[PDB]
Amino acid sequence: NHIDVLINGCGIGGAMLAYLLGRQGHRVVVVEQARRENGADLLKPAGIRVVEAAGLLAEVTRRGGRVRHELEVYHDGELLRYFNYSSVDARGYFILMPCESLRRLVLEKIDGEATVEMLFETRIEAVQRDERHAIDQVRLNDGRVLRPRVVVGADGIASYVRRRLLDIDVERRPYPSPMLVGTFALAPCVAERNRLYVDSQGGLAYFYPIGFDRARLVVSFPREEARELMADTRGESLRRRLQRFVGDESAEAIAAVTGTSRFKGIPIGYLNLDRYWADNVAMLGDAIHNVHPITGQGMNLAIEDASALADALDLALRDACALEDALAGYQAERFPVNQAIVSYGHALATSLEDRQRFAGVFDT
Numbered sequence: 001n002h003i004d005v006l007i008n009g010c011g012i013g014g015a016m017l018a019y020l021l022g023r024q025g026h027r028v029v030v031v032e033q034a035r036r037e038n039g040a041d042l043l044k045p046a047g048i049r050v051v052e053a054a055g056l057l058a059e060v061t062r063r064g065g066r067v068r069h070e071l072e073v074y075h076d077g078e079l080l081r082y083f084n085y086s087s088v089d090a091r092g093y094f095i096l097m098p099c100e101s102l103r104r105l106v107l108e109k110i111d112g113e114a115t116v117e118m119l120f121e122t123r124i125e126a127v128q129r130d131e132r133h134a135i136d137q138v139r140l141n142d143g144r145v146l147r148p149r150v151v152v153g154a155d156g157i158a159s160y161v162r163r164r165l166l167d168i169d170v171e172r173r174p175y176p177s178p179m180l181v182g183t184f185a186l187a188p189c190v191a192e193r194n195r196l197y198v199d200s201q202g203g204l205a206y207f208y209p210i211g212f213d214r215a216r217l218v219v220s221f222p223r224e225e226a227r228e229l230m231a232d233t234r235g236e237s238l239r240r241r242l243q244r245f246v247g248d249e250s251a252e253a254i255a256a257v258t259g260t261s262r263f264k265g266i267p268i269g270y271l272n273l274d275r276y277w278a279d280n281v282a283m284l285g286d287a288i289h290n291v292h293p294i295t296g297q298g299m300n301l302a303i304e305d306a307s308a309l310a311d312a313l314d315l316a317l318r319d320a321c322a323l324e325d326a327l328a329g330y331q332a333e334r335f336p337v338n339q340a341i342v343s344y345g346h347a348l349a350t351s352l353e354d355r356q357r358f359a360g361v362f363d364t
């Protein structure tokens with residue numbers, strides 16, 4: 001019952017890590033509380049590099065992923081910034097791909113990896129540590145006992161591994177504006193170009209295509225206004241509010257908002273843990289950092305962490321270096337990258353209303 005890595009959580013980060021480790025022939029058990037069976041949509045160049053390394057890039061666009069290289073940002077109805085991400089660098093492009101679509105693809109690949117065992121509707125019950133304080137035994141709620149060299153927390157914003165195995169508590173810092181996302185019919189303007197709108201009253205509306213034939217609309221307003229707008233389920237108050245700061249180019253996208261019933265809240269946190277690991281326990285993704293969803297980077301960073309952790313763990317598992325050195329390496333690589341986006345998200349979210357401050361944040 002000796003295994004190389006026990007991964008808690010089979011979200012996008014956990015799945016990507018399991019697949020990358022499995023491809024190397026490491027013995028992996030993934031534990032997921034939910035049945036096999038909504039999240040972020042964005043892959044940035046660094047995330048795309050991981051996907052490309054995994055041999056998955058072709059399948060991504062085959063399954064409705066969209067390559068893009070432009071963004072317009074409006075403030076109070078007028079164009080504030082236009083970004084061409086590929087103007088200097090041909091590989092500057094980003095990809096829009098639903099988290100669930102990418103995860104399903106990765107799970108299909110894991111299905112073919114003989115050294116990976118995925119356990120759904122399963123959870124960690126108890127752990128045992130050795131005299132060196134490394135976890136040496138883990139019992140699952142099905143009665144399964146495993147002896148892993150490494151335990152990984154890929155278990156998201158409420159990480160059991162963080163809270164219970166590492167006994168880390170995280171202060172919460174709520175924001176005054178929620179963010180919500182709904183899915184609608186795809187208007188030609190949205191198929192054309194991603195457009196983000198914000199206003200001096202704290203409104204935000206971001207329209208972008210998703211999959212083959214749908215569009216997302218991500219919105220944010222101060223809490224009580226957002227409540228009012230969502231309460232009018234036939235959508236009239238929301239369309240009217242949008243019309244206040246969203247210009248004609250997106251008129252059809254506003255018209256596509258036929259109701260509010262299917263809007264979903266998005267989690268908003270602010271975190272970058274000072275330690276990404278302790279003993280033989282490492283964490284990735286939302287377990288170690290929470291970025292404001294205005295950045296779009298929740299999935300992307302989980303994928304970037306997974307790749308860096310796969311590299312570090314591969315080295316430790318091959319005995320190319322001590323686990324403690326490998327994990328220290330993982331933190332050194334990832335922490336400044338994750339930190340920069342956490343800071344950026346908070347700066348963006350808090351500067352919305354102030355046009356030049358907001359523009360200032362974009363430039364850096």
Ligand SMILES: Cc1cc2nc3c(=O)[nH]c(=O)nc-3n(C[C@H](O)[C@H](O)[C@H](O)COP(=O)(O)OP(=O)(O)OC[C@H]3O[C@@H](n4cnc5c(N)ncnc54)[C@H](O)[C@@H]3O)c2cc1C
Nearest residue numbers: 009011013033039040155156160285286293296297298302
């Ligand atoms: C509706 C919605 C919209 C979102 N949109 C945005 C956005 O616009 N911009 C943005 O930046 N981010 C967004 N996100 C966040 C983004 O989806 C996450 O940051 C991303 O999924 C993080 O990946 P992860 O692998 O670290 O964690 P997760 O994808 O959360 O995966 C964690 C996995 O661990 C499992 N798990 C948890 N606890 C246990 C346990 N005790 N035992 C076993 N398994 C466990 C969970 O079931 C889950 O499968 C959104 C999230 C939601 C819910």
